[PDB]
Amino acid sequence: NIQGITKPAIRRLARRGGVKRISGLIYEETRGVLKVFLENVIRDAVTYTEHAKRKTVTAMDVVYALKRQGRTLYGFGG
Amino acid sequence: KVLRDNIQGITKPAIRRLARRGGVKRISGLIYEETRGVLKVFLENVIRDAVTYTEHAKRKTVTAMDVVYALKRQGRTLYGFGG
Amino acid sequence: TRSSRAGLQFPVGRVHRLLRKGNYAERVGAGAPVYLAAVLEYLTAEILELAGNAARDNKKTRIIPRHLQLAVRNDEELNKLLGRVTIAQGGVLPNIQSVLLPK
Amino acid sequence: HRYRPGTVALREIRRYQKSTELLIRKLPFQRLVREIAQDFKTDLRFQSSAVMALQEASEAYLVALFEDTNLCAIHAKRVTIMPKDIQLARRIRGERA
Amino acid sequence: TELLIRKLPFQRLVREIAQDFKTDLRFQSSAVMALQEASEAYLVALFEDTNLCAIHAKRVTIMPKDIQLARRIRGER
Amino acid sequence: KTRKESYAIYVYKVLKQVHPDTGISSKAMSIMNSFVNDVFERIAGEASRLAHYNKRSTITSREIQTAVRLLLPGELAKHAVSEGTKAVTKYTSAK
């Protein structure tokens, strides 16, 4: 599941980030960091959705979650 | 009375002590001027916000709450002076 | 309308209504919606100006988000304003570190 | 023939920095999000727009983190990013303790 | 926990700084004190991050590029 | 069918005001709308805090002017004050 974030996808992300050479343990470290970030953001989004008494996590819940974390995103009904 | 070159009022031993509280053991030579510049920028921003708050307040004196508000703005909230 | 009375293209009535129900204060003045609408209208005017410039540079007639990202990040002041904002499908500016370049 | 190591990497850097499309294939990321959410509340449903927003935010954050990691690695006279680089960048950022 | 920056040079520096934004400005001593506390906390944190950077360079002496790296990573400009 | 609102048309008229022979994509309009909402929220909240700090009940043009100067970097803030003062003055001219 978490391994579904493929090693080459991480290389592509790093390449867009300007990285030339990548270490082996990097990929696992990035999987962990992405896991933590998604955990926090989804936790806030769920908190919002639960407070909305809805069984569907909506995009506005996600946007509010990133707004809380100081990671504001545009293009999804801000 | 005019004020000039007060940034050098931040003496080398003061910055050295400050780094010591920061856990720094060995300090390079040109560091001191860069700490002066960084402190200069930080003071510039904080006092800009505080001065604007005073200007809305229509007061000729900066009050502590103005400084606290400005610090809260910079994501640098401070306790011990009100607010 | 009042946007006509204020020479503005943004709706003064909407911003006044939003200021009221946005629980920002118990009472709201008259000039405040006009001033605020003007500020927003210029800010988007600057954004659209630079985005259209970038689209012309990329030889496109319709502005796509990448143009917006280029306009915001290339401009130092707009980049500072949107310092904690990620623009969807915005991408990143082309930037390669010197030591990574071939010798 | 053969391209010398490190050249095709620069070519991909040029390629991906000019483009904006997402670099993680959708379905594995969606399944990962669904697994993570399941641990917080059961029988949950997601709007595709919400999932897309999550992917955009996550990918942008990862790209910024990789930028900081590359800067940190270069500061160490290095060219290869290694886990200590990510750790230091996260620490200075203040997200990791 | 006592302050490391000496009070009077800091006060003179701040007065000059504020004068350049606007003239004829007075200060409550408590406001100057709060400014000094904030400055000292900020630069102590900055020195901590600098020392972290310097160790990452397999070095023991902090160098100006270390603070540049720390402030870049902090998102400061 | 719910009648959701946005700023799209006004953004488009502004675009014509600055780039007449230029268009925009749909999600790009979404980004413009999100930016407008975010700036509105920031400035309005800043004015609200300004009102509380001075123990006053009204958010006037002065409060948002100082909020704009507080939130925006130098040159944009300068232009923003000029436009806001101009628009408010001309509105007070009309009736």
Closest residue to C66, CB basis, from D20, D60, D67: D20
Q: In the CATH hierarchy, which fold is given to the domain comprising D1-95?
A: Histone, subunit A (1.10.20)
Backbone region of residue B78 per phi and psi (left: phi > 0; alpha: psi in -120 to 50; beta: other values): beta
Q: Which residues of A touch D69 (CB under 8 A)?
A: 17, 19
E strands along B1-82, which residues? 26-27, 61-62
In chain D, domain spans:
1-95
C99·D74 Cβ contact <8 A: yes
Residue C62 token pair: 């319709």
DSSP at F5: -
Q: How far apart are CA B69 and CA F22, in angstroms?
A: 43
| Residue of chain C minimizing CA distance to F73 | C77
- Check if the beta carbon of residue F43 is closer than 8 Å to that of residue F71: yes
DSSP at B74: T
A74 touches chain F (CB under 8 A): yes
- Check if the beta carbon of residue B42 is closer than 8 Å to that of residue E35: no
- Check if the beta carbon of residue F39 is closer than 8 Å to that of residue F23: no
Q: How far apart are CA A30 and CA D55, in angstroms?
A: 15
β-strand partners of D81:
A22
Q: How far apart are CA A27 and CA B22, in angstroms?
A: 33
Which one-letter amino acid corresponds to residue A19?
A: V
Q: In whole angstroms, how far apart are CA C103 and each of B83, C95, C99, D18, E76?
A: 57, 17, 9, 23, 32
Cα-trace Rg, chain D? 17
β-strand partners of B26:
E61
In chain C, domain spans:
1-86
E56 touches chain D (CB under 8 A): yes
| Residue of chain D minimizing CA distance to C89 | D20
- CA geometry: angle D16, D18, D22, nearest 5 deg: 50
Cα dihedral across residues C57, C62, C67, C72: positive or negative: positive
**CATH code (residue A69):** 1.10.20.10
Summary count for chain F: helices (H), strands (E): 4, 2
Which one-letter amino acid corresponds to residue F39?
A: V
Residue F44 token pair: 């309005």
DSSP string for residues in C17-47 = HHHHHTTS-SEE-SHHHHHHHHHHHHHHHHH
Q: Which residue in this structure is represented by tokens 């005073």?
A: B54
Q: In the CATH hierarchy, which fold is given to the domain comprising E1-76?
A: Histone, subunit A (1.10.20)
H-type alpha helices, chain E: 7-21, 29-56, 64-74
User: Chain A interface, mutation test: which of F6, F24, F31, most A Cβ atoms within 10 Å?
Assistant: F31
D72·E49 Cβ contact <8 A: no
The CATH code of domain F1-93 reads: 1.10.20.10
Write phi, then psi, for C72 (nearest 5 degrees).
Answer: -75, -50
In chain F, domain spans:
1-93
Q: How far apart are CA F11 and CA F53, in angstroms?
A: 34
Q: How far apart are the first and last CA of chain E?
A: 29
Q: How far apart are CA F51 and CA D19, in angstroms?
A: 45
Closest residue to C97, CB basis, from D52, D60, D74: D74
Q: Which residue in this structure is represented by tokens 């948002």?
A: F64
Q: How far apart are CA E45 and CA E47, in angstroms?
A: 5
- Check if the beta carbon of residue D81 is closer than 8 Å to that of residue A14: yes
Residue A58 token pair: 């909506």
Q: How far apart are CA F35 and CA F27, in angstroms?
A: 12
The CATH code of domain C1-86 reads: 1.10.20.10
In 3D space, the residue among E33, D3, D31 whose CA is nearest the CA of residue A38 turns out to be: D31
Cα dihedral across residues B57, B58, B63, B67: positive or negative: positive
Domain of residue A74: give its range: 1-78
Residue A42 token pair: 């989804």
F50·B56 Cβ contact <8 A: yes
DSSP at A69: T
A5 touches chain D (CB under 8 A): yes
Distance from the E26 Cα atom to the nearest Cα atom in chain B, whole angstroms: 4
DSSP at F57: S
Q: How far apart are CA A57 and CA A41, in angstroms?
A: 12
Structurally, chain A folds into a number of domains equal to 1
Q: How far apart are CA C65 and CA C83, in angstroms?
A: 17
Torsion of CA C29, F82, F50, C81, to 10 degrees: 130
In 3D space, the residue among D84, E50, C36, C102 whose CA is nearest the CA of residue F37 turns out to be: C36
| Residue of chain D minimizing CA distance to E55 | D76
Say what the resolution is, in angstroms.
Answer: 2.9
Write phi, then psi, for C97 (nearest 5 degrees).
Answer: -70, 145
Q: How far apart are CA F17 and CA B82, in angstroms?
A: 48
Q: In whole angstroms, how far apart are CA B30 and each of B35, E45, E58?
A: 9, 19, 20
Q: Which residue in this structure is represented by tokens 């904030």?
A: E38
| Residue of chain C minimizing CA distance to F28 | C65
3-state class (DSSP) for residue E61: strand
- Check if the beta carbon of residue F43 is closer than 8 Å to that of residue C39: yes
Closest residue to C96, CB basis, from D10, D53, D61: D10
3-state class (DSSP) for residue F59: strand
Tally C–F CB contacts below 8 A.
174
